[PDB]
Amino acid sequence: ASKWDQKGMDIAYEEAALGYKEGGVPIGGCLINNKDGSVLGRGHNMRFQKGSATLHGEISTLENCGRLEGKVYKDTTLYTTLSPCDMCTGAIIWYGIPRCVVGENVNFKSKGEKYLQTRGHEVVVVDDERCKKIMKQFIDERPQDWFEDIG
Template identity: 35%
Template sequence: MPTDHERFIQMAIEEAEKGGAEGNSAVGSIIVEGGTVIGVGRNTALATKDPTAHAETVALRETAVALGRSDFSGCALYTTFQPCTMCSGAIMVSGISTVVMGARPNSGESPYGDFSVENLFQVSGWESKIEVVTGILVEECWKVRLDWAEKNGLNR
């Protein structure tokens, strides 16, 4: 039986697949409060011509509308791939309590150098405020990303 983390990452994978099928980067995110999905997002940056429309920010925007507030303390964000620096900043200011992620770039493959959400949260003074859970359905998350990259003639 899958754990809650696996169940919600699987939902994020489904969003990533939709985003990839729509011609966007294959990343998906889900925001959960008390076991209930509040926000869902997939990368729509290419389709919308909005460089901020990453899966995490789309899910954060949907959550703000659903909850009618901008403080998401007590919520968990599930994402198929390590959030970028922009999304990590949005996660911090939104008050998300937990980030659960599947895959992350291999060393030297990130456009952000050796960036990690853990390092950003630490240098920003947020490491004690946001729990980071890694290693959930990593292979499945990588598969979605690699399938999308292959389909679009891209490297990782």
């Protein structure tokens, strides 16, 4: 699966950078088929774009994949620029996405990371400097938007 990790993080970061330029929270993702590297879906946080409580970058990514047979998710990696919250963690667990690759968990880390490992999922934190820099820039410019969301 790891031979698609560069592709997956590059797409996730592109989604985060699209979101940033749209005036949103720079959190992006994509879902890749581990066998052939095909992109099933990609998305970014739509909190500000759509006034959305639930379209986190990971949720938006899964929504953008469309209706799938459940078996499709079982050989995928979900790429996200930021450590997933408990809701997004639960979506990974529920669909049985076996592997989650995380840009960084410096600006945010939920109990979801550990819970994924407890439920038998592989979690890889790449500690990517591009992801940390864009998230830190949003947090510095828009602290009330950030700390009102994550608390």
